[PDB]
Amino acid sequence: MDDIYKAAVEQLTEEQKNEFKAAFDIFVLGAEDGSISTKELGKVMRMLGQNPTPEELQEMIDEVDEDGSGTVDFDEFLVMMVRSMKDDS
Ligand SMILES: NCCCCCCNS(=O)(=O)c1cccc2c(Cl)cccc12
Ligand SMILES: [Ca+2]
To answer: Pick from 70, 75, 68: which is nearest to 2 by CA?
Structure first.
């Protein structure tokens, strides 16, 4: 079902969309399809001011990976935001 999630997707316009889509490119500016991993992860967090081990970051991808695949597609991705948004933690 996962409806309670699509409910928020309707709130998202299109201006804030181009903001995220632009991020993916970074996480995968040379990957085949666009599957993100602890590999291209620490790559973006580098521009900020962090650079932990791929073992710790996996924890962030293991929480959303509701299919155990070690990836973050534009799918389960939205969920992440919707969650932290409607409820930060
Ligand atoms: N660590 C996840 C929290 C996301 C932060 C919200 C802002 N989105 S973001 O561009 O900063 C961003 C950060 C970390 C992982 C991402 C993946 Cl796997 C896909 C797309 C964007 C990602
Ligand atoms: Ca996944």
So the answer is: 75
How was it solved?
Answer: NMR
The number of the ligand 1 atom at minimal distance from the alpha carbon of 81 is 6
d(CA 79, CA 82): 5
Question: Please, are residues 41 and 61 in contact by the beta-carbon 8 Å criterion?
Answer: yes
Ligand 1 contacts (CB < 6 A) are: 23-24, 27, 36, 60, 72, 77, 80
Residues constituting the chain: 89
Rounded CA gap, 48 and 32, in Å?
A: 25
Cβ atoms of 61 and 45 within 8 Å: the answer is no
What tokens appear for 81 in the block?
A: 């935001």
Ligand 1 atom closest to the Cα of residue 23 is 10
